[PDB]
Design a binder for this molecule. Sequence first.
Ligand SMILES: [Mg+2]
Ligand SMILES: [Mg+2]
Ligand SMILES: [Mg+2]
Ligand SMILES: [Mg+2]
Ligand SMILES: [Mg+2]
Ligand SMILES: [Mg+2]
Lengths: 255, 260
Amino acid sequence: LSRLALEADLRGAIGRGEITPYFQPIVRLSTGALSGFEALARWIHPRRGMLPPDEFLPLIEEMGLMSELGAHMMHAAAQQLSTWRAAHPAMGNLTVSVNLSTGEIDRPGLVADVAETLRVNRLPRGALKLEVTESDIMRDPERAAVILKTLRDAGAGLALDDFGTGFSSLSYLTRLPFDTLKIDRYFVRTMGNNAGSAKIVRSVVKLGQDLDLEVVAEGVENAEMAHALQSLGCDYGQGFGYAPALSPQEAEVYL
Amino acid sequence: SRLALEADLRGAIGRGEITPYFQPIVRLSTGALSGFEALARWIHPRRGMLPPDEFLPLIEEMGLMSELGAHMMHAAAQQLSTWRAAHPAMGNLTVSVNLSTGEIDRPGLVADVAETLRVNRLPRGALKLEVTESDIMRDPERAAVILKTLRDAGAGLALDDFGTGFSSLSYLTRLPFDTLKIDRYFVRTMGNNAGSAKIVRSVVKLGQDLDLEVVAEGVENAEMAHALQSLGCDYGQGFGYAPALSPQEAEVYLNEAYVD
Ligand SMILES: [Mg+2]
Ligand SMILES: [Mg+2]
Ligand SMILES: [Mg+2]
Ligand SMILES: [Mg+2]
Ligand SMILES: [Mg+2]
Ligand SMILES: [Mg+2]
């Protein structure tokens, strides 16, 4: 029924401004302070209401609009970040992250588009971060190494999302210019009653410290998980224990 | 000369021409001996000692890998029991043997290992099997089960050449290894290479936080040993201590190790 109607509605949705970022807070465990946001795509359909990425992203992909979606999300994330910095100069280097789907990292013109977005939004280096999964790196490690260095050289921060799943290669990591590792949600939420998950959480945290990478635990559901991560030296946390992806005006309240 | 060697390999394991030499593994802090890695050497009647890279490939072309693994394990196990009996005061003396790619999938491996422990009357963990990460990345869940059964039979388990390839943090947390070895290359070049320095440091901490004893391979001098122990690395092996020794030479090294 709808599987085909959505495609009709989805065409042009990006240009109409219907797919917009929502912002989930990332908090520094040591001080409790807001340190940045992860921007997450949301489709506010005029009829259907808000729809989550799992329901539209696959269709964006089939229609070949992934590149258009990524440019839009990055642009919207960056503009919001600059608008907040102009309204609250007290902040310094509050960051915003954007997720790239598999292969987006190789799209033609990505580096120029990022440089252009940091320029026009007058952002500091590292203010806008790109989150990728290891699929993009295992895919072709040497190529990933080239692309990632040029994105870092252009001013983008870089985060390795969902770390702990799949290979979680210690060797490949030491050669990639990441500045942030994110512990996947599953490990964080089962670390209290799953021995395997507890070992992955501790190792990732210690590994980040040994490699000078900042570590963000994803999926912090409550203050107890928060406190455990803090005791291990984990840098940041994000999850429903703090807040979901917020609309701009709700996110602005944290500033 | 390739097929000439191949002809010479027929029945060579049988005539006992391929035998183990033992390289010491030592505790870095106290400089004491903890064990040996058993390394195969072919003492050809005419050509003299031939290293594994020159015959190991031939052993596999002829499908003799299992016969070689069996012989090396038996020979290392017999030598270990003799040493342990002549050295009651070294409760932790172990010997290691290397399984080449695919050996852990052999049907009767666990039974063979179990028999070797029994006939040589070895305590649990005295005999270790060293496997590479590639031999495990082929089928992670299969290998996990097989490794667990080897642990349960009383064999020690070491993950050799760590640092190379994937060096998977996720898989290492789930596999029942007791020892992790850092590949020679990173230990050699950690002095002049930021990357190798990072691999060596983080493998040590990862290993230790997982309750694994870490062994640095390729310790070539007192400089590498001191830099490794100032990282808290457990053990080391390498030409800076001794190469793979003949059994008569290893016995002397063992005897001298009693002296502080
Ligand atoms: Mg993400
Ligand atoms: Mg994702
Ligand atoms: Mg994630
Ligand atoms: Mg070895
Ligand atoms: Mg080997
Ligand atoms: Mg090795």
